Every structure is written in C-alpha cells, then in structure tokens.
Amino acid sequence: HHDGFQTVKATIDWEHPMFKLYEKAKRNGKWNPADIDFSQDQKDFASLTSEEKISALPLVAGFSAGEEAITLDILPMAHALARQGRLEDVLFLTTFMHDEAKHVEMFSRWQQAVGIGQMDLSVFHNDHYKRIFYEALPEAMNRLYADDSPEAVIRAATVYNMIVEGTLAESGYYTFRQIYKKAGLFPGLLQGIDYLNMDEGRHIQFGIYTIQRIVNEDERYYELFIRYMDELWPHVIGYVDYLTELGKRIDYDLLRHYVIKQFNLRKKQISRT
Amino acid sequence: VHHDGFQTVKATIDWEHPMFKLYEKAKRNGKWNPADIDFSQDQKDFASLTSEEKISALPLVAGFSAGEEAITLDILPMAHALARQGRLEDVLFLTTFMHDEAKHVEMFSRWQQAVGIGQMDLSVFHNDHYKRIFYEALPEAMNRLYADDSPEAVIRAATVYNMIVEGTLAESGYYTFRQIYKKAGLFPGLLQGIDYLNMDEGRHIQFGIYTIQRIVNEDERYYELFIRYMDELWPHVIGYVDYLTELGKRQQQLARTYALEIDYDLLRHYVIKQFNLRKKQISRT
Ligand SMILES: CCCCCCCCCCCCCCCC(=O)O
Ligand SMILES: CCCCCCCCCCCCCCCC(=O)O
Ligand SMILES: [Fe+2]
Ligand SMILES: [Fe+2]
Ligand SMILES: [Fe+2]
Ligand SMILES: [Fe+2]
Ligand SMILES: [Mn+2]
Ligand SMILES: [Mn+2]
Numbered sequence: 090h091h092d093g094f095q096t097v098k099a100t101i102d103w104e105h106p107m108f109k110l111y112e113k114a115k116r117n118g119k120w121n122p123a124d125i126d127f128s129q130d131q132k133d134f135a136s137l138t139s140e141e142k143i144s145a146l147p148l149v150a151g152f153s154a155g156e157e158a159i160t161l162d163i164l165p166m167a168h169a170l171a172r173q174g175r176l177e178d179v180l181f182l183t184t185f186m187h188d189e190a191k192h193v194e195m196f197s198r199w200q201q202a203v204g205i206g207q208m209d210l211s212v213f214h215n216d217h218y219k220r221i222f223y224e225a226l227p228e229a230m231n232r233l234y235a236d237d238s239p240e241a242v243i244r245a246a247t248v249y250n251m252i253v254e255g256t257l258a259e260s261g262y263y264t265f266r267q268i269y270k271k272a273g274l275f276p277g278l279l280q281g282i283d284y285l286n287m288d289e290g291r292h293i294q295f296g297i298y299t300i301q302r303i304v305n306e307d308e309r310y311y312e313l314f315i316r317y318m319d320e321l322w323p324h325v326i327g328y329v330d331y332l333t334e335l336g337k338r339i340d341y342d343l344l345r346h347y348v349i350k351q352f353n354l355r356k357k358q359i360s361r362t
Numbered sequence: 363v364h365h366d367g368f369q370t371v372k373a374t375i376d377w378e379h380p381m382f383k384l385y386e387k388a389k390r391n392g393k394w395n396p397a398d399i400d401f402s403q404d405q406k407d408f409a410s411l412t413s414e415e416k417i418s419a420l421p422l423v424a425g426f427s428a429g430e431e432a433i434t435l436d437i438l439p440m441a442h443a444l445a446r447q448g449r450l451e452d453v454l455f456l457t458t459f460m461h462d463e464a465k466h467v468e469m470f471s472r473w474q475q476a477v478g479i480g481q482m483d484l485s486v487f488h489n490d491h492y493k494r495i496f497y498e499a500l501p502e503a504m505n506r507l508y509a510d511d512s513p514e515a516v517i518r519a520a521t522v523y524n525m526i527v528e529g530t531l532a533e534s535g536y537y538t539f540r541q542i543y544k545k546a547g548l549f550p551g552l553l554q555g556i557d558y559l560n561m562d563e564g565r566h567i568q569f570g571i572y573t574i575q576r577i578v579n580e581d582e583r584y585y586e587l588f589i590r591y592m593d594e595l596w597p598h599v600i601g602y603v604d605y606l607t608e609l610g611k612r613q614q615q616l617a618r619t620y621a622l623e624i625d626y627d628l629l630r631h632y633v634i635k636q637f638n639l640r641k642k643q644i645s646r647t
Contacts, residue, residue, distance in 0.1 A: 091435070091497045093485055096427040096471040100480040111464075115395050123386060154368040160453060161365070164442040171435040176467075179434060183464040187457035190385070194454065197370040206374040211367050223365045231363065234508060 095176050105177035106298055114184035114291050120284040122195035127202035127277040134203035134275075145275075147332055149196060150210035151218065152261060156192040158222050159249060162230040163189065166245055169233040181295055188288040195281040202277075213335075217327030225321065226253060239303045243310055247317040250296025254289055255355040256325055260348040262286045268339060297358050304359060311361045318356055325352065369450050379451035380572060388458035388565055394558040396469035401476035401551040408477035408549070415616035419543065421609050423470060424484030425492065425602070426535060430466040432496045433523060436504040437463065440519055443507040455569060462562040469555040476551075487609070491601030499595065500527060513577045517584055521591040524570020528563055529640045530599055534633045536560045541629065546620040571643050578644060585646040592641055603633050 095101070101108060134142065167182040200206050214222070229245040265282055269275045304310045329348050333341035369375070375382060408416065441456040474480050488496070503522045506515050536556055543549050578584045607626045610617075617624045 091432060091501055093497075094428040094431045096431050096467055096474070097424055097484045097488075099483075100471045100475050101468065103475070112397060115397070115465075119393065121389050123389070150371055153370045157368040157370050157450070158365060160457075161445040164438055164445060168438040168442070171438060176431070176434075180464045180468065183434075183457070183461040187461045190454045190457040191389075193370055193450075194375065197375045200370070201374050201377070209373075210371045214371075223367075227363065227365055 095174070101180070102177055107175075107181040107295065108177035110291055110294055110298075111177065111181040111184060114181065114188070114288075117291075118184055118188060118288060120191070122191050122198055122281060122284075125195065125198065125277045125281055127199055130199060130275050130277045131202050131204065134205075144336065145269075146205065146208075146210055147213040147335055148261060148265065149200065150213040151328075151332075152258070153193070153196040153200065153210065154214060154218075154222055155253060155258060156189055156196060158226055159253065160186065160189040160193050162227050163249070165230045165233045166242075166249075169237040169242065173237065178295075178299075185292055185295065188285075188292070192285050192288070195285065199275075199278045199281070215328060215331040217324040217331060220324045221248075221253065221257075221321060221328070225324075239306065239310055240313060243300055243303050243313055244317050246296045246299045247314055248321065250293055251300070251318060251355040252321045252325060252352075255293055255296070256348060256352045257328070258289065259351050260329075260344065262289075263347055264344050267344065300359050304361065308361045311359065314359055315356060318352065322352065369448070375454075376451055381449075381455040381569065382451040384565055384568060384572075385451065385455040385458060388455065388462075391565075392458055392462060392562060394465070396465050396472055396555060396558075399469065399472070399551045399555050401473055404473060404549045404551045405476050405478065408479075412615060412619075414613055415619055418610060418613050418616040419549070420479070420482075420484055421487035421606055422535060422539060423474065424487040425531070425606070427467070427470040427474070427484065428488060428492075428496055429527060429532060430463055430470060432500050433527065434460065434463045434467055436501050436523065439504045439507045440516075440523075443511040443516065446511065452569075452573075455565075459566055459569060462566070466559050466562070469552075469559065473549075473552050473555065487606075489602060489605040491598040491605065494598045495522075495527065495531075495595065495602070499598075513580065513584060514587060517574055517577050517588055518591050520570045520573045521588055522595065524567055524573070525592060525640045526595050526599060526637075529567050529570070530633065530636045531602070532563060533636045534603075534629070537632050538629050542622065542624055545622055546616070548620070574644050578646065582646050585644065588644055589641060592637070596637065599633065599637065603630060 134145070137145075163182065163186055167179060167186070170178040170182070197206075200208075200210075226248055229241075229248045232241050233245060262282055262285070265279065270279050300314055304314065325348065326345075329345055333345055437456065437460055441453055441460070444452040444456070471480075474482075474484075499522055503515075503519045507519055536559075539553065539556055544553055574588055578588065607630065610624060610626060614624075616622075
C-alpha cells in the first residue's frame, strides 16, 4: 500500500543529484535508432569475406545479449528504489530503461539490415559470458525483490554498472572504434555506438552515486564492493581471452590491456569515504 | 532466475509486433520536456486569486499528482512480469510508458512549485474512495504480478490501472480541467502540460486494451472477469467523483468571479461515458 505521495505532501527534490541526471538525460537523450541509415552497413557487410563476416559477429552478439539483459534486469532495481521512496532515482531510471531499450533496438536493427537476423549468435557466448549475463546479472538484480539491503544493492550496482557496463561495455565501444572506424566500415553502427556511449556516461554515474551513497554509510561496504569486482574478474577476462583467441583466427594485447585498465579505473571511482 | 537466451541474439525484435509499433510512435511523438513549460503566467494567475478561488483547482491537482506518482511506482511489476514471459516488444514499449509517467509527475510538481504551494500538503483532498483505488487497489493488483502473473492477475492489473485510473478518471480529469480552466483563461502552462500528457496517455490506453484483449482471445471466461473488475471499482470511482463534486459546489468563488457555469452534472455523466466506452473497447472475441 502507499502511505502517501511525495508530490502531494511536498514536491520533487529539485536539487537531488539523480533528478539533475534525469534532466540531463531528457536533454541529451533524443536520438532515435530508427533514424540510422544502415544501407552502407549492409553493403560493407556483403562485400566482406565470410572470414571477415564472422570477425564482426562475436562482438555484436556480446552487445545484443548484453543490452537485452540489462533492459530486462534493471526492473528489480527500479522497484526496490521505488519501494524505498527514492523518487528521484526512479525518475532517472525511466531514462535509463528507455536508453537501454534503444540500445537493444539499435544492435537488432543493424543485425537485420546486414542480413544476419536469422543467424543465432549465441554460439559466441562462452561459459564465462554466460556466467555474467545469463546468471550473475539477473541473479543479483532479482535478489532485490526480496532483499534490498545495502549489501544487495551494492552487489547489483557493482555487477551491472561496474562490470557489465563499466568494464565490458566500455571496452567493447573502444574495440569497435579501434577496428571499424579506422577501416571506414559500418558507419551506421558506429553512429549508434557513439550515441549509445553518450547514454552510458549517465548510466555509470547513477551506479557510482548508488554504490558510494551506501559505502558512505559504512566503509565496511567498500570492501564488499572490491570483493564483488574481483569475484567477477575471472569471467571478465575469461570472456576477453575467448574473444581474443577468436580474432586471431589489431593487437589484441592492447584491447586486453584496455579491459584491465577499465576494471581498475572503475574500482577507483569509489572511495572508502 | 537465469536467462535461457536472448531474442535479439537468436533472432531479432519482432518488428511487426503491435507493441513495437507503439514503441516507435512513442519515440516519435513523445519529445516534450516539462522543464520547457512556461509557468510564469500560472504563478501570476494563482497569485491573482483569493484564498477561496485559490483552492478550487487544488483537489484536482492532488488527484493528479498522486495518480501519476502511483503509476510511476506501480507499473514496474507489470513490466517485470511481461519481461519474464519473454514479451520483449511489450517491455520496450513500456520503457516509453514509464518515462512518460515520470514526465507527468514532474509536470504537476513543477506547477505546484512555481505557483507557490509546494509546501502545502494536498492529501487532504484524497477521500476514502480515492485511497481505496490509488493507495490500495492499484498497488495490490500490480504487486501481485511478482508472484502471480496468471492471465487473471494480468487482466486485473491492466483493468485497474489502464481502464479505470487512466481511461476513466484521468480521461475525465482532462475534460474537467478543460471545461473549467481553459474557459477561465487560467493556468496556460498547466494546460499545455495537460495537453501533452493527454497525448501520451492515448498510447498508454492502447497498451492496456492490447493487453486485456490479448488475454480475452485465449478464453472468453476472461471477458466476464474484465467486466466484473470494472464493476467492482465503479463505486470508488463515483465516490471520488461525488466528493470532488461536493467540494466544487461549496467553494464556488472561482466559478462566479470568472462567470463560468461549472455543470457538475455534465462532468458526472462524462465519467460514466468514459467508463462504459472503456468496456466497449474490449470485445468478447
Ligand atoms: C578483444 C577485446 C575485448 C572487448 C570487449 C567486448 C565485450 C562485449 C560487450 C558486452 C557488454 C554489453 C553490455 C551492455 C551494457 C548497457 O546496456 O548498459
Ligand atoms: C467533478 C469531476 C470529476 C472528474 C474526475 C477527476 C479525477 C482526477 C484524476 C486523477 C488520476 C490520474 C491518473 C493518471 C494516469 C496516467 O498517468 O497514466
Ligand atoms: Fe546502460
Ligand atoms: Fe575458462
Ligand atoms: Fe499513463
Ligand atoms: Fe463514501
Ligand atoms: Mn546500454
Ligand atoms: Mn500519466
């Protein structure tokens, strides 16, 4: 039951950081994936050699699955914060969710346009990928229906924001750029990736805000945060090694260092105080 | 529980799904930002009213602010349930639904802030009937879906929120606010807000009808449930309406300072009109 309503008893906290992030999201979040011209992307893909055609697909499969996952899986988080009365958080998360829907849509549209929509790209998810996306992610998010303790929220934000978006996805945008914009290939996908990377700058900020406000109440949670990151590293780098083994069949030595860099950078964005 | 796989890895989005088409319309037609509305004439208009004129609109604003905030919290279980059923295109659409409702909450709260009543607690205009729908039945029917996503649970949730709250009360609210404050040349920024809001809600009702009718096509037993759930809520619908009516009648200072004939019997029949129209948008097959 609702006890009352903040915009009836009072107003929105206009000075809340997440309400300000909400405002930014409405201003900077107007792109529509339906407007992306994929026609050159189709030609590029067709002109590729089958050996080149596959080289693209592992990454797209990682992302298509990853965006769809978070679209389905943020909803428990939004619900738990709604139940705690954090209205400005909820306002922000509606932009988060619609961003992610556009992300799902964009990769799906590219798949469709280059002609691989009928292809099942699950074959490029290895065990380590499945551990993160098929298992740990939904596990940590769905927990929050029955357990919204600080430890549960921090574990979900760490998994979704610091590992999935902040290590794997950040590293993936960089990989796409380091490979295809140099080549002059796939300009519509790279356009989408650029819009998406803008969106994701906001998403990481909600995650930092969330993890940090909890850490602030008890620095015991800081060590929780680090432990959770390290728990998932073996699957992060297991996936990366799987993908680097594939491409060698571009210095994957560099992209495997960018992943390592991102992971440590994300750890540093949270302070013990 | 874990994901089996992902539709946009095995396949693609179902581009011909009607909820995808509705998602596409939502993106194209849902660009308005309440932060852009000019409330300066509203703040002056509100200040130009007496204490007694000043309140005639607040009961409506309190019903609206509470209603928009409730659904912002209470749609989330519905989106989760459909996500669990693999209804990806529904979920995509629902991201626009939820973001719309966020803007609706924001708009009324901006208006309250700008006209100067942010500090005033407007809960006093929620009578027991209002509470039974918005403080109780709405969240009960939605939160159910976390543990019971059966067709009958989904019908009930869509009926409460989409057919009653949006399609009866909110549709009547927009009419009332037009029949009164557009005729009074009052609160232009609020009515611009309400215009945009009402456009949003045309899509929301289409999702609710799609959802209810989808379930009724599986089995007609469910048509009767829809009618019964509509009927179980009518008394609170009309209980709130009578209450809002008796308020307006005894604070009639704004009606005659602005030479308006506010017909609280016409407004009452429009509510009844919306209720039955909503029944007619669901067919037994
Ligand atoms: C060979 C170098 C490795 C490059 C790393 C690529 C990893 C693929 C990206 C998958 C994660 C995408 C998750 C979406 C996050 C979000 O939607 O916020
Ligand atoms: C005297 C005339 C009575 C008219 C009825 C007025 C009722 C106020 C409506 C408040 C509910 C608003 C819910 C909005 C639903 C949505 O945002 O989708
Ligand atoms: Fe994201
Ligand atoms: Fe391994
Ligand atoms: Fe709505
Ligand atoms: Fe009563
Ligand atoms: Mn994303
Ligand atoms: Mn609304």
